[PDB]
Design a protein around this ligand. Sequence first.
Ligand code: NDP
Ligand code: DH1
Length: 186
Amino acid sequence: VGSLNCIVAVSQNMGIGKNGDLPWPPLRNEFRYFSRMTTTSSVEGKQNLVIMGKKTWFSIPEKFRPLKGRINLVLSRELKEPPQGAHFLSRSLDDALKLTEQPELANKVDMVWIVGGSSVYKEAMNHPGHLKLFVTRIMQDFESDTFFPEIDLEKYKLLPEYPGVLSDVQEEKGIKYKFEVYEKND
Ligand SMILES: NC(=O)C1=CN([C@@H]2O[C@H](COP(=O)(O)OP(=O)(O)OC[C@H]3O[C@@H](n4cnc5c(N)ncnc54)[C@@H](OP(=O)(O)O)[C@@H]3O)[C@@H](O)[C@H]2O)C=CC1
Ligand SMILES: COc1ccc(OCCCCC(=O)O)cc1Cc1cnc(N)nc1N
């Protein structure tokens, strides 16, 4: 199994969601960036795995579920089987990560991408080990009801460049944003 990563787009006030959708209007190229990063596997004969909470799963429009070309794992203690369209169900992050090493997935998974929501991000970011955060900074405030957890910059070093990540300011629908990559290893 390859790298562990989180990916998120986040407003200035740390907002990631409102009423089960994004706090801001659709940003087509930003969605493209998400799809590119999570889908692109460095390793032949493997796919990336996406891990997400139950509400994050249901927040993705049905026509885009499962996230194509990726193995889709949902976290839930209430569900008894994976939602329609989902590939796997785990009762915890540690369980999901363990599963990735089992016979059914050991040979199949390249990178793993935590795609939300708040509680999965928090546990992942606070768990010792080698972890990257792909963070898109939406450079405005947006009314939100769910928030990205604090990034501890003592741990998470902002990388000065990363291959395939544009460094300049992007803009769609009058909203400026920029891409960042953070890395910790503890
Ligand atoms: N801007 C961005 O990049 C992103 C935005 N979002 C947005 O953020 C919101 C995210 O939703 P959020 O409210 O944080 O919900 P989550 O997706 O984290 O879902 C919460 C639910 O997932 C299960 N769950 C979460 N963590 C675990 C775990 N470790 N083990 C087992 N089960 C778990 C549910 O449990 P159960 O069935 O057990 O009760 C829990 O109630 C939505 O508005 C979405 O649009 C989401 C991802 C990215
Ligand atoms: C779970 O997070 C997401 C899952 C899917 C997604 O949309 C991508 C497909 C385009 C579908 C459409 O057009 O409606 C977006 C997210 C959120 C997200 C966005 N951006 C970044 N950088 N990270 C994310 N997690």
